[PDB]
Every structure is written in structure tokens, then in C-alpha cells.
Amino acid sequence: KAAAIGIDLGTTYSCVGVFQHGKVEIIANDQGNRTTPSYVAFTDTERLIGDAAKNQVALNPQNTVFDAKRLIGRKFGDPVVQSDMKHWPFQVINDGDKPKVQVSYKGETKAFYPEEISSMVLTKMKEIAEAYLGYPVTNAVITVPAYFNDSQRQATKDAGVIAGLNVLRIINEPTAAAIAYGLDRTERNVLIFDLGGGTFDVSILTIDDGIFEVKATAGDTHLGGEDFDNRLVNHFVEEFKRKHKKDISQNKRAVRRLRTACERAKRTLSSSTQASLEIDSLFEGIDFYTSITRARFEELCSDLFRSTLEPVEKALRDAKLDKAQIHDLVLVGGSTRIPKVQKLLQDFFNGRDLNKSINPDEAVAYGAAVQAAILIKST
């Protein structure tokens, strides 16, 4: 019968997988991308989700929503909501102690609950899976951070039901990554090092007889790939001032366009030692054609890369385990593809091999897809 799917509903990107013909297929979207931005944009004529939404952000900042995972299942009074709101270009309103995102859509003011925004992202992932499978998909496993509370898990499950999905189970992101690597089929102590687009999560699990126990969680909810992009943005703003004698830092569109180029250059630096950066008419008709070296990017982010080890040390203390007691070091998130981040973690664990054979950007969806296939058999 119809296969069930695994969905990694990420803060910045989402990913969908399916276990078919004895293997996991991570499904590419219509643009050919195996991950989709967790973005929704509203225009005078349409609602855009994923790549098309992220692509037009510089020309529609107030009506392009992202980071709904930071609001989902929270009350307006939550300290996290109170702190996070100042950093977003879109409006957050308060409706009886519930946050809602307020936008302009088809020439009208509309407001959506966080679970309605995440339901739009989940509808996109469901449609990406149906385009590959060729039949309607109704069952899914959706992942969440280990630290999510009952309200945040319930709101995520509600987002799935709004999307027309029957949610077989809400499972922890680190548990899904461990399932992907077969770590439950080898007491096994696993460290999941999840450096995402906007958050950094370290989890220590103990797996015994198929049972997962969360021994410790540590990290920084405000450290991720976006922060490395911003170190490049600042460096380039300074370069533009030196070359052209113009300060672009107050031009919101120019900064946004520069940030988009920086993210692309950063990805290239994970596989090449140099990356070109080329923007046409960045400011006042001036074309900004330049380049950056991997060594310079490493210098610009040196403090941030080093800071990823403190949460690892903290999690080991909380779990009451030494480095030698950890059996597996699992990489999660595209930011773990950065060679310097891998070198720092390997050196900390005295040269040990890292589990990185599954694309780190896809490992959570991969594990969710394996678990979805196991659970649908039971129904």
C-alpha cells in the first residue's frame, strides 16, 4: 500500500524522505533541491512556499515569513517570543496571549498562527513526496528538537493535521539521526552534533535494547550557519567601503542581496579553498565582483567555530560520561560540512572518525523515513 514519509521540519530548511525498495530516497523538489527553505511569502497575487519564497525576500521583506519554529506552541508572554521578535522583518501580533504573524496578502491584512505557517511548509513537503511517488500521501513521521515541550510537540502535530497528514509519531531529531546510522542495532552512547542554519544542538543519547534515553542536551539556539553568513556580510561591507568609498550597511536590500551571495560563497568554501562573489548593481549601479579564501572565512568565524566545543564539554559533564565512553559522533546540519568544524570536533575526540556517510542536511529526514516505514506496518 501507500508508503509513509519522514519529514524534518527544520528552523531554516525542511527535508522529506521515503523508504522504498529497501532503501531511503531523499526527495528532490521541483527545482531539484533535496532540502526546501522553511519560508512562506505573500504577494498581491499568490502564496509562495520554499525556494520561490526565499528567492524574493529582498523585494518583499515584510511579507516573507520564516522562523515559525521559534514561535510554534509558545504563548506571547514567553520570554523567547519577547526576545526573538525584535530580529524579524515581519510583524508579530498578540491575540489573547497567542502570537500570530501579520502580513499583507492579495491586498488585505491577514494573520496566521505559527502552526498555520508550519502547515504550509508541511503541505509543500507532502506535495514534493507525492510528485515523486505518483499517488496521495497521508501518513508521516515529523521530527522536533529533544527539548521541545508538550505544547510545542502538540502544535507541530496540529500543523501536520492542518496539512492533511496523519502523524504516526512526533520523534526527537537526535533519535532520528541515530536511527539513520543504525545505532540502535549494534548500552550505546551517541553524541549528535547538530549545527543548523540558526541553532546549535548537542545531544547525548544512551540506546539500550532499542530504547533511547536522552542523557543530556546543550547548545545555543542563536548559533548557526546564518551567523557565519553575517561574518562574511560585515567583511564585504568593509571591502565595498574601502574600494568605492560608499557605506552600504543602511541599505536593507543591498545587505540582503549581499547576504544571499555570502551563503553561496560559504557553501563553495566547504569543497574549494576559494569562492567568487559576484553581484550586479549592488549599490548605485556599482557591480561588486570579488572573492574570498577559505583561510580568511576561517579567521572571520574563528571564535564561533571554537565556541561549538563548550556545549560538547557541558553535555559530557551533564551525562556524567568521559570522551572515551562515547561510541559514535554523528554530524547533523549542512554547517557540519565546514572542514574547520570537522577538524575541531575530531581533534577534541583525539582523532576519531565521524559518522558523516549520510548527507548531514538529510540524516534527520532519513531516520524519520526509516521509522515511518516501521510504524505504518503496525497499523
Ligand SMILES: OC[C@H]1C[C@@H](Nc2ncnc3ccccc23)[C@H](O)[C@@H]1O
Ligand atoms: O541547515 C541550513 C544551513 C546549512 C548551510 N549549508 C552548508 N553550509 C556549509 N557548507 C555546505 C556545503 C555543502 C552544502 C551545504 C553547506 C546553509 O547555508 C544553512 O546555513
Ligand SMILES: [Mg+2]
Ligand atoms: Mg535541523
